[PDB]
Write a protein that binds this ligand. Structure first.
Ligand SMILES: COC(=O)CCN1CCc2cccc(N)c2C1
Length: 150
């Protein structure tokens, strides 16, 4: 009963989270996951500011209202070579990564590790935060509030 959460640097408070390193988060689970980080789904405006500070990924993830990929550099295999906040238009499927927004983070790039999941609740799951530099933090808990997600 274990979940890995792979997290990025924060850019103007915005970061990316993947669950178990594969697209596997629903819209409801995404909201709950950000809540566990004392964060919210980003607005489009928040994501655009993050992009302007250096944020890009090669992964679809939820924001408020849409599923997006922030892109700075054109890459043929990431968002069909687009730059900017690329919006997913057409998909059959419902499970992606998520973005989250923490208002208390620094205003620009923060590439320090994440060392806490401050708002997880009591539960039986071993939840491990995995940073890109390999640094890990684990705790026993839960964050999913919808049964359909469990
Ligand atoms: C930003 O989305 C990605 O970089 C997907 C690739 N995964 C690769 C695996 C991994 C492991 C720990 C932390 C992070 N951020 C990642 C990112």
């Amino acid at each position: 009963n274990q979940i890995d959460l792979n997290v990025t640097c924060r850019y103007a408070g915005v970061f990316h989270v993947e669950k178990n390193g594969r697209y596997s988060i629903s819209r409801t689970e995404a909201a709950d996951l950000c809540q566990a980080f004392n964060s919210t789904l980003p607005t489009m405006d928040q994501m655009k500011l993050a992009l302007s500070k250096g944020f890009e990924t090669c992964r679809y993830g939820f924001i408020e209202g849409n599923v997006v990929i922030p892109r700075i550099h054109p890459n043929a295999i990431c968002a069909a070579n687009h730059t900017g906040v690329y919006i997913l238009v057409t998909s059959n499927t419902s499970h992606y990564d998520t973005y989250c927004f923490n208002a208390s983070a620094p205003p620009e790039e923060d590439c320090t590790s994440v060392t806490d999941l401050p708002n997880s609740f009591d539960g039986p799951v071993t939840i491990t935060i995995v940073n890109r530099d390999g640094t890990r933090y684990s705790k026993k808990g839960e964050y999913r509030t919808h049964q359909e997600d469990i």
